[PDB]
């Protein structure tokens, strides 16, 4: 509801995302009849207001209960990313750790920025990682930029999937 990023507001029917009839195929919402495969990204509709969303079963528009927004090994504040980003053998593994285990997209993006600085901007992996960090932070155009800049360097399946 509160994140608006689509350019158009009344796009032509057929050019935006926003069969058996409900007399045959069951439905989860008014439209979007039941599917055959649940991925953790299926929507099957969109709740209009915030009142319409809190007052609805928590797994009506998602494949898991809907939210309001979407000892330790090493201490993130302690280690200085400026030092790890000088050596990529440690840098890539440590970034994967910070981004996928600790889920701290900010320190991850800091490490990725420093590491891309070090590698002089000519390796697609750090570009795709920065793009993933941006996409997590909600900046879809600053992430599209990095995915596009990575596709120009090495065309790989992952970059096409991220960019789509």
């Amino acid at each position: 509801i509160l994140d608006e990023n689509a350019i158009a507001q009344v796009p032509r029917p057929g050019t935006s995302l926003k069969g058996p009839s409900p007399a045959v195929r069951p439905v989860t919402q008014a439209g979007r009849p039941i599917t055959g495969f649940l991925r953790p990204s299926t929507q099957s509709g969109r709740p209009g207001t915030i009142e319409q969303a809190i007052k609805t079963p928590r797994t009506a528009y998602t494949a898991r209960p809907i939210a309001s927004s979407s000892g330790p090994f090493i201490n993130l504040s302690r280690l200085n990313l400026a030092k790890y980003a000088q050596k990529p053998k440690l840098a890539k593994a440590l970034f994967e750790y910070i981004f996928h285990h600790e889920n701290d997209v900010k320190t991850a993006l800091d490490l990725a920025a420093l590491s891309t600085e070090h590698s002089q901007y000519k390796d697609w992996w750090w570009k795709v990682q920065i793009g993933k960090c941006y996409y997590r932070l909600g900046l879809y155009r600053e992430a599209e930029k990095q995915f596009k800049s990575a596709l120009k360097q090495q065309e790989m399946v992952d970059t096409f999937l991220y960019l789509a």
Partner: peptide, 19 residues
Amino acid sequence: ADMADNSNLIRSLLVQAED
């Protein structure tokens, strides 16, 4: 980056306050 984080926080808090 930091302002994107805080904006996401603020949208979450708007939803929570409406709730």
